[PDB]
RNA sequence: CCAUAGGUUAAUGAGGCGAACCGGGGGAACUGAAACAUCUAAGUACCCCGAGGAAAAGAAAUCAACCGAGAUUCCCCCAG
RNA sequence: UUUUGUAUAAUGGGUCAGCGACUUAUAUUCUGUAGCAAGGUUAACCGAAUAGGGGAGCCGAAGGGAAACCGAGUCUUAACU
RNA sequence: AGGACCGAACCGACUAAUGUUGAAAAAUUAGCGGAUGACUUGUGGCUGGGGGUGAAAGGCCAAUCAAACCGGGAGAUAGCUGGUUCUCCCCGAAAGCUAUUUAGGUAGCGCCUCGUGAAUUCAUCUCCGGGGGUAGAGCACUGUUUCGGCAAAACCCGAUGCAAACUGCGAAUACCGGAGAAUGUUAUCACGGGAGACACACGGCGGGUGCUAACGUCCGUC
RNA sequence: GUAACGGGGCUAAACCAUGCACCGAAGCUGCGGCAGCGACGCGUUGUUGGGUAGGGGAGCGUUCUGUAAGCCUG
RNA sequence: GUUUAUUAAAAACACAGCACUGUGCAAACACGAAAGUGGACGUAUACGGUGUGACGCCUGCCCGGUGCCGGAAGGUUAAUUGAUGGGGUUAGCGCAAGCGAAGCUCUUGAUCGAAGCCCCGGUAAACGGCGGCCUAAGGUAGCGAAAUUCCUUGUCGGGUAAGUUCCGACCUGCACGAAUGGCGUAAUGAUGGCCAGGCUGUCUCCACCCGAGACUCAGUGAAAUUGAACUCGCUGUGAAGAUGCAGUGUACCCGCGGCAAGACGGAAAGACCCCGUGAACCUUUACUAUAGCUUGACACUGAACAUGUUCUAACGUUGACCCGUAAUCCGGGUUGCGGACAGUGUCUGGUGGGUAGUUUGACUGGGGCGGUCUCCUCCUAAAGAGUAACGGAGGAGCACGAAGGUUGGCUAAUCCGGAGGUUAGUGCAAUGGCAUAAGCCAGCUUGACUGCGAGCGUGACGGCGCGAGCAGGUGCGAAAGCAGGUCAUAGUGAUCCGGUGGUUCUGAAUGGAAGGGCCAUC
RNA sequence: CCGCGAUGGUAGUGUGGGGUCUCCCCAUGCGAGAGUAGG
């Protein structure tokens, strides 16, 4: 990231945005998932 | 004393005569109205001038004081 | 050892869909009230880190 | 004044050495930051004390998240 | 060797023999090549086992948004031509 | 009597020559100063490194002193200098721009190379469409200039020149775009892997600077 | 130290004009050979091959491990 | 006397003498985290520090600056203390919006508060200063072309045939001057300058001689250096001063004694000079710290009223005596003195080159000094864009709720109603523009709007610029239309950190909150 | 729509070549401005 002495990029640009934890413990389930549960019955503990 | 200059402001004809353009092209950057805007050319702030249809640009000499117009020839 | 991100990158850049970086513009943090609105509207939605700058922003965030 | 300090003798133990590892008492600077003071190097080097075959730690005033786990230590992940 | 440029009166070497300088570890990206393929691959560890076990994990198959969130869309905006 | 006098030992070190791979990492020779004193010398002791000691020269502290020596941190750091080892084949730069406590460093871009993809993509010429304000020219303008006339020597008129920062004119070339053929190993553009380079030199042409001085200096272009 | 034709020398062996000859390079051509790239007949044709930094491609040789209780060697 | 052992012996240091200043003894001061020790088994006729430097005659004026000393009314001011206000949470109260006790909690900071500083004085043998109307005061005595005088070899006198030196004067002191002493001064000096007698190979100008080398023979036997050498002159050429290139001249092969013009000879990675975001040590009113010194609060730390002192019991004792004990340590005891002081710990303000770590820009016809550094206009700039120099010329770091928007109306300079036609005007440089006026006036106004934005220009990038049109809502005008600031081009500052307002975001068990995000803004 | 102008010569200049090289010349291509006849 050093440019010479100029004020790099990752300087120059300011900082934006925070971090979300609850998205952390988010996830997507694809319907070629679906099938491969066993029993049937989709939730979050036949998931993992 | 001297030693003083100001940025070159790269000013003049941005699409020159017949040259196809779409509608917002700059065709002449300048300052005040060396150029005229003719048929579908604007004229900006600082005295632009721009296509506002798509055509080709077309110079002409005209009026009782024969000045310099540009106008865009809508294809 | 692992490669250390350089943090200050990390809180400035974000890797989009096919790979590019997204990014806060410059100028719209104070001395506001000079600038144009149409100038401000314009500073505020995210843009893409050009092509000559990629280099740099990859090297930096090898973890993105 | 009683006494206590002090004195003599006896018994028992210690003392010194040793490469690393271990716990503790102290603790740099070069260097990096393209200068430099916060920061870094690093609780590193070094000095000191003490131990053991290992040491230290250890049996929740611990986590967790409303479900639960169940002392300490070490390894792989979590994750640059 | 260094230089715009060296027979240079710039540098280095008296000669010979021997030694003498892009490595190693880990991470990461790209290329080649091999395996398997919407999957791929296991770490520590167990195992007398280069086997076999171990899928904890990691990468990929979805993105957009600062985020909640929505999702082949999403963000922007009261709302998009 | 005396930090008294002359002068050996003893202690010094003013001058000169020699010596300078020495007889000697400070001496020898001839002269020189002190020589009862703040003298000199033997033996032993004490002061330790940002510390000592110094009638003070940054002097001396083991041939070492504006911070001893030895070991360690330690392979400090070194944008600097030097050096970098067998062979052949293909391509082949740059010494520029921008930024920089930057200027002999470095970064992005330009230029090299390798890979992948893609258009009649690119170049030359011809024809067509364009904008110019340079060369030249000119003097209406903005200044400058001379002569004559006229006349409040102004102004005005005729005649004559001059201009990077003058233009009532204005090329060649160059540049942008369009069309067409021929030619060219895609010569083009994009994306990705790897760079190097950012001290240039002279010569021609157009110039600034300098003295139309410099193998001078600074641009443009070949 | 001649020292302001490179020298000898030159009255052309100087200069101007016109012309035809010749010499002259690693240029061009001829003959033989090697290699890169462009189409494929796995045919031969077109063309290219000066190079520093530097990029790309392909190799030689050295020590050591397997192949090797093999193979060579008094 | 002393000194740079090893290029400086001196005018340097020291010195007796002088002065200022500190110091009452457990002295100041110094070495030491401390105990202690030196000072000193001394006691102000003593000891430390500082300057001056025998002696003689002397030592002038300035206290404004910096220091030191004294003051202590007033201003300012630390820790500490926590009045007051504001917020978070929630028992409740509310049908809901919200409100909201106690407690806990986040914040605010009244009052208290020493030294210091400001302030008022003093002080120059403190650091220092000592004029051409001005100052704190304007240099006295003495001395003066000087260890000081640039101009300068000043000028005059002396000495010499001739004297930039010397001696004596003059004063025009570039830029003397009174204890960082002035002026003198007998004696002293391996001290600096000048002159004379004697003396001479110092010299005119060298000659001869005696010895040690050098030379030859025998024995022993180094060294620095060295790309390779078949290692000439000259004139040219050329990384610009040639044995090696060109042309030409000269030259049989090889030693020995000699000489040093060249081999840019040998020696030492130039010490000068510049450069490196190198080093060291030194300085200071550079920055930041810090030992030390100093201030107060709380602690060790107590008792009687005063809003004064007294007391003893903590504590001190480097007073005395006794014992451990053969002991100037130490401890215990007795006693006197001092006494909640002193002193030490934590906290805190001041002071702090005593000590430490560091910083102290770049460009540049070498560096320094000067100038410059960002932005705008013109020219250089070669009729697209761009284009350098410590090239040539000027400007900006704003202004304006009208000087903006729109509709209607209007047209200048200058000369003598007319002529003239922008020669004026533009909010401000210059260039290009502007009558349809962009110049200028009046009425009505807030488009100097919010969300967006086809497309394009210009940049390595960060960015910057131009923009029809779409949605919402607006002004002007009758309407077409125009309006997203101003004739255009300068009037500017990334990011971080934080502040303020807003907010269908987040909220570390949960509800909140804090903090964060997002939008606006500083 | 927006109030002059030939012809000829001259100046300049792209490319190539040359000289006595601060400036020119030759071959070839382009060819003003001013002025003249005239309108
Ligand atoms: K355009
Ligand atoms: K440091
Ligand atoms: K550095
Ligand atoms: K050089
Ligand atoms: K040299
Ligand atoms: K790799
Ligand atoms: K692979
Ligand atoms: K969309
Ligand atoms: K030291
Ligand atoms: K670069
Ligand atoms: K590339
Ligand atoms: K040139
Ligand atoms: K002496
Ligand atoms: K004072
Ligand atoms: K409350
Ligand atoms: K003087
Ligand atoms: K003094
Ligand atoms: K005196
Ligand atoms: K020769
Ligand atoms: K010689
Ligand atoms: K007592
Ligand atoms: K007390
Ligand atoms: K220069
Ligand atoms: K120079
Ligand atoms: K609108
Ligand atoms: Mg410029
Ligand atoms: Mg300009
Ligand atoms: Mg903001
Ligand atoms: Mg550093
Ligand atoms: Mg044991
Ligand atoms: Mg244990
Ligand atoms: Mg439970
Ligand atoms: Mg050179
Ligand atoms: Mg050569
Ligand atoms: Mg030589
Ligand atoms: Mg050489
Ligand atoms: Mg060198
Ligand atoms: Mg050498
Ligand atoms: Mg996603
Ligand atoms: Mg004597
Ligand atoms: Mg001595
Ligand atoms: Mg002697
Ligand atoms: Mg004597
Ligand atoms: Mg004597
Ligand atoms: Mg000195
Ligand atoms: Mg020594
Ligand atoms: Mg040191
Ligand atoms: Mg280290
Ligand atoms: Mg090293
Ligand atoms: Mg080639
Ligand atoms: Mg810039
Ligand atoms: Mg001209
Ligand atoms: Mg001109
Ligand atoms: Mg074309
Ligand atoms: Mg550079
Ligand atoms: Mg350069
Ligand atoms: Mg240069
Ligand atoms: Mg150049
Ligand atoms: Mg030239
Ligand atoms: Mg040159
Ligand atoms: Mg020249
Ligand atoms: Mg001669
Ligand atoms: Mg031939
Ligand atoms: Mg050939
Ligand atoms: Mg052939
Ligand atoms: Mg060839
Ligand atoms: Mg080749
Ligand atoms: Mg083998
Ligand atoms: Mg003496
Ligand atoms: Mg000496
Ligand atoms: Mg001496
Ligand atoms: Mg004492
Ligand atoms: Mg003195
Ligand atoms: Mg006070
Ligand atoms: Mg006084
Ligand atoms: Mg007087
Ligand atoms: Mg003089
Ligand atoms: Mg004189
Ligand atoms: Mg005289
Ligand atoms: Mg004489
Ligand atoms: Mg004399
Ligand atoms: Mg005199
Ligand atoms: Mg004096
Ligand atoms: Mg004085
Ligand atoms: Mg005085
Ligand atoms: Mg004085
Ligand atoms: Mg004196
Ligand atoms: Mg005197
Ligand atoms: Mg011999
Ligand atoms: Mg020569
Ligand atoms: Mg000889
Ligand atoms: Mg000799
Ligand atoms: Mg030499
Ligand atoms: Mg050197
Ligand atoms: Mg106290
Ligand atoms: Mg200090
Ligand atoms: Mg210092
Ligand atoms: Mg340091
Ligand atoms: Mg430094
Ligand atoms: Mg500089
Ligand atoms: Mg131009
Ligand atoms: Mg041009
Ligand atoms: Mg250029
Ligand atoms: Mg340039
Ligand atoms: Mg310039
Ligand atoms: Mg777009
Ligand atoms: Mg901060
Ligand atoms: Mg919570
Ligand atoms: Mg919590
Ligand atoms: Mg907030
Ligand atoms: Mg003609
Ligand atoms: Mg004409």
Do not use: W
């Amino acid at each position: 990231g050093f440019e010479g002495g100029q004020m790099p990029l990752y300087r120059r640009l300011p900082k934006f945005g925070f971090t979300s934890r609850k998205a952390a413990i988010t996830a997507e389930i694809r319907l070629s998932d679906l099938a491969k549960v066993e029993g049937g019955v989709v939730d979050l503990n036949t998931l993992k | 004393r001297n030693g003083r200059d100001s940025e070159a402001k790269r000013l003049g004809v941005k699409r020159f005569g017949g040259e196809s353009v779409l509608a917002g092209s700059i065709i002449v950057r300048q300052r005040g109205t060396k150029f005229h805007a003719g048929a579908n050319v604007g004229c900006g702030r600082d005295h632009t001038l721009f296509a506002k249809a798509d055509g080709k640009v077309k110079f002409e000499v005209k009026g009782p004081k024969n000045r310099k117009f540009i106008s865009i020839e809508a294809e | 050892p692992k490669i250390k991100t350089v943090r200050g990158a990390a809180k400035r850049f974000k890797k989009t869909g096919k790979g590019g970086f997204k990014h806060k513009h410059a100028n719209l943090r104070h001395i506001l009230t000079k600038k144009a609105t149409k100038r401000k509207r314009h500073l505020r939605p995210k843009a893409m880190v050009s092509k000559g700058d990629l280099g740099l922003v990859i090297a930096c965030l090898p973890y993105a």
